[PDB]
Amino acid sequence: LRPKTLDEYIGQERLKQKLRVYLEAAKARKEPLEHLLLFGPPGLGKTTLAHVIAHELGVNLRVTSGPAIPGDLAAILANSLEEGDILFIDEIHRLSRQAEEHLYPAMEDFVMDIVIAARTIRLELPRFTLIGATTRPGLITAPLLSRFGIVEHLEYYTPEELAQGVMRDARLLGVRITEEAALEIGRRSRGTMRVAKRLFRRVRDFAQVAGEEVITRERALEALAALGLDELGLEKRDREILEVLILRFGGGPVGLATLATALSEDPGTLEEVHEPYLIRQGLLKRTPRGRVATELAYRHLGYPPP
Amino acid sequence: LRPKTLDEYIGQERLKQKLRVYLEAAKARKEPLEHLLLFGPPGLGKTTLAHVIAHELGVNLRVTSGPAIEKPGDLAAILANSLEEGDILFIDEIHRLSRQAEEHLYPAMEDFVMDIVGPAARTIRLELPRFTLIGATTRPGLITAPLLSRFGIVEHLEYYTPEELAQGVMRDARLLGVRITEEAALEIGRRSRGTMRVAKRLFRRVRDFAQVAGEEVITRERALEALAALGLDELGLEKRDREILEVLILRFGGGPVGLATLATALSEDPGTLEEVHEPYLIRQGLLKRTPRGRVATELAYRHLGYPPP
Numbered sequence: 068l069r070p071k072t073l074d075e076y077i078g079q080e081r082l083k084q085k086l087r088v089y090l091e092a093a094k095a096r097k098e099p100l101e102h103l104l105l106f107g108p109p110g111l112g113k114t115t116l117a118h119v120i121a122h123e124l125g126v127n128l129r130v131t132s133g134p135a136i137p138g139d140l141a142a143i144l145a146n147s148l149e150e151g152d153i154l155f156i157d158e159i160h161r162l163s164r165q166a167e168e169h170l171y172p173a174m175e176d177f178v179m180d181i182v183i184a185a186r187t188i189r190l191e192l193p194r195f196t197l198i199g200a201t202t203r204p205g206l207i208t209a210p211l212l213s214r215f216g217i218v219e220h221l222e223y224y225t226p227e228e229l230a231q232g233v234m235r236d237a238r239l240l241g242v243r244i245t246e247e248a249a250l251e252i253g254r255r256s257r258g259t260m261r262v263a264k265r266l267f268r269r270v271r272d273f274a275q276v277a278g279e280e281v282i283t284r285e286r287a288l289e290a291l292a293a294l295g296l297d298e299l300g301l302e303k304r305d306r307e308i309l310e311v312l313i314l315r316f317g318g319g320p321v322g323l324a325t326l327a328t329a330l331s332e333d334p335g336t337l338e339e340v341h342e343p344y345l346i347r348q349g350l351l352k353r354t355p356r357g358r359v360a361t362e363l364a365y366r367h368l369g370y371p372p373p
Numbered sequence: 374l375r376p377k378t379l380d381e382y383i384g385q386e387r388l389k390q391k392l393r394v395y396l397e398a399a400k401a402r403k404e405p406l407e408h409l410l411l412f413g414p415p416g417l418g419k420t421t422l423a424h425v426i427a428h429e430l431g432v433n434l435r436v437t438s439g440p441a442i443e444k445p446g447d448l449a450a451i452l453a454n455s456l457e458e459g460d461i462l463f464i465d466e467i468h469r470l471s472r473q474a475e476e477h478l479y480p481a482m483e484d485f486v487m488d489i490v491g492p493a494a495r496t497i498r499l500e501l502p503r504f505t506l507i508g509a510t511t512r513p514g515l516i517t518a519p520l521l522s523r524f525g526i527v528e529h530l531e532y533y534t535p536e537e538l539a540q541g542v543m544r545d546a547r548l549l550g551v552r553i554t555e556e557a558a559l560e561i562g563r564r565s566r567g568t569m570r571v572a573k574r575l576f577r578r579v580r581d582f583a584q585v586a587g588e589e590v591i592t593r594e595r596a597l598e599a600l601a602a603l604g605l606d607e608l609g610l611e612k613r614d615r616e617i618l619e620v621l622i623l624r625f626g627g628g629p630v631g632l633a634t635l636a637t638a639l640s641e642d643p644g645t646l647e648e649v650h651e652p653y654l655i656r657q658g659l660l661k662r663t664p665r666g667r668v669a670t671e672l673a674y675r676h677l678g679y680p681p682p
């Protein structure tokens with residue numbers, strides 16, 4: 068289901084060694100671990116890493132959310148926590164300005180004011196560990212980032228790690244995916260575990276409809292082609308974006324007002340859930356005057372070069 | 374208009390001696406006078422006495438009302454913003470103070486510190502300058518023991534003799550521009566129920582009647598006939614009181630009647646009736662509060678000209 072020991076955690080090298088060193092040192096000196104901050108793209112397994120750390124330290128977990136916190140933070144900190152446990156907060160950059168200022172005394176000297184004529188009681192808190200997860204250090208204020216003892220980064224997964232995660236999922240579900248098929252599914256994923264799991268579930272549905280018990284590489288490739296994925300993992304939406312840019316604008320510089328309107332999209336999700344992968348794959352460039360196709364989308368889309 | 378010196382105050386003997394002694398002693402030792410509480414029936418000149426005391430002390434006033442300083446934040450605002458050292462804070466109807474408002478009055482009166490009304494909000498303990506608080510209420514039973522214990526001086530306002538009401542009427546006529554005679558003013562005061570407000574109201578009504586009749590000097594006969602036109606008897610009874618006695622005697626034979634049949638027989642309520650009607654009747658020996666009801670005391674039969682039982 069979900070890994071518990073740090074050895075069961077899939078991938079994430081150059082971080083498990085450092086995390087293990089810190090955890091064993093904290094256990095040896097018999098003190099709670101310092102507050103930890105986890106960066107990286109969403110859905111790489113930050114909550115799972117928090118659970119693994121909590122299970123390795125032999126303490127409880129109090130997972131909560133950023134936009135779910137006023138005195139409710141104090142209510143969570145007061146009774147729901149023992150000494151040395153974790154208070155993993157997801158999307159810590161979305162904390163309210165009022166609620167953020169209450170965290171600094173909590174993390175600094177472990178005393179904070181509780182609500183209630185009078186509303187100022189400096190209730191002392193037990194020593195605890197706070198883990199925060201946010202997608203980018205630029206979204207967090209300097210005073211909050213300064214109060215975290217350990218800051219780490221989660222990198223993307225190699226296709227083999229995603230393949231073995233797909234293997235674990237299939238073993239748990241009761242499927243007999245093959246090595247080549249799972250590796251192809253992982254390769255067509257965008258280095259994200261959630262995307263790999265979603266793709267595996269869709270391939271499982273397609274194979275079940277087709278009437279098969281063992282999924283081979285050819286069947287997985289056919290199902291993924293039916294989904295609408297290319298060899299670079301591009302969906303239909305990204306291909307549509309590149310096609311409309313190249314056709315309607317000749318590939319020339321286009322600002323992030325004409326491109327979104329031409330696609331019936333918004334300047335929101337587009338350029339934050341579509342363009343990052345295109346730039347990472349060398350498919351789109353952010354010219355100061357607009358955007359270009361980098362001469363590679365012409366080869367990918369089979370169009371004559373400019 | 375309004376008297377300022379304690380000598381100009383009309384009547385109220387056996388109280389001006391003690392009040393003068395206290396005022397002069399406080400002036401001699403150069404300290405604010407202790408908190409004062411005066412009882413008495415309403416409209417005998419309590420606010421006027423407060424004004425006289427304040428003027429004789431040579432300080433200001435902050436006259437307010439009982440049911441107007443609830444939510445004690447405004448009480449703190451009044452005590453801090455609009456007061457100096459030694460200023461009276463006369464509160465009318467002090468018994469109608471809210472429990473929350475009253476609880477904040479005790480520290481202000483005892484040690485002159487109060488908690489004025491956000492993480493902290495109502496936490497500041499403002500130091501309060503020495504001041505005098507004067508309270509006004511009708512009956513000592515309406516005030517709670519903790520509040521009554523905080524007052525250094527407690528006195529009582531008694532009713533006015535007819536001569537005092539008469540000279541008050543003369544002063545009112547002089548201020549207005551009328552030439553009432555001494556006998557007419559004495560009759561008006563005699564038909565008043567020992568209170569100054571009623572005497573002034575009667576004088577204004579008699580002035581209107583005389584003006585309508587087309588006169589310039591009001592004589593005793595004119596005042597008597599105008600008061601008869603008003604509906605006042607020799608004992609000062611209004612039409613309502615005579616109606617009460619008449620309905621009791623006729624419809625109930627003068628026998629004991631509770632304060633549920635009597636109010637309903639008069640379309641009144643058990644409220645103002647027995648509060649603004651029966652006090653005078655009992656005081657004049659016209660009605661008695663029997664345990665089983667009420668009786669006419671054998672004098673209402675003579676007053677109303679009915680055969681005795």
Ligand SMILES: Nc1ncnc2c1ncn2[C@@H]1O[C@H](COP(=O)(O)OP(=O)(O)O)[C@@H](O)[C@H]1O
Pocket residue numbers: 068069070075076077078108109110111112113114115232260261
């Ligand atoms: N490295 C991993 N090994 C095993 N399971 C994982 C891993 N990473 C994520 N998961 C699975 O994904 C879930 C975490 O949700 P996810 O969206 O991937 O994290 P995030 O919300 O941080 O992106 C867990 O339930 C877990 O089963």
Ligand SMILES: Nc1ncnc2c1ncn2[C@@H]1O[C@H](COP(=O)(O)OP(=O)(O)O)[C@@H](O)[C@H]1O
Pocket residue numbers: 374375376381382383384414415416417418419420421541569570
């Ligand atoms: N002893 C007095 N001498 C002169 N004027 C008085 C006296 N008593 C009351 N008054 C007049 O009555 C007014 C006070 O109102 P009143 O109803 O008599 O007091 P309370 O509301 O305490 O019964 C003042 O304006 C004042 O002119």
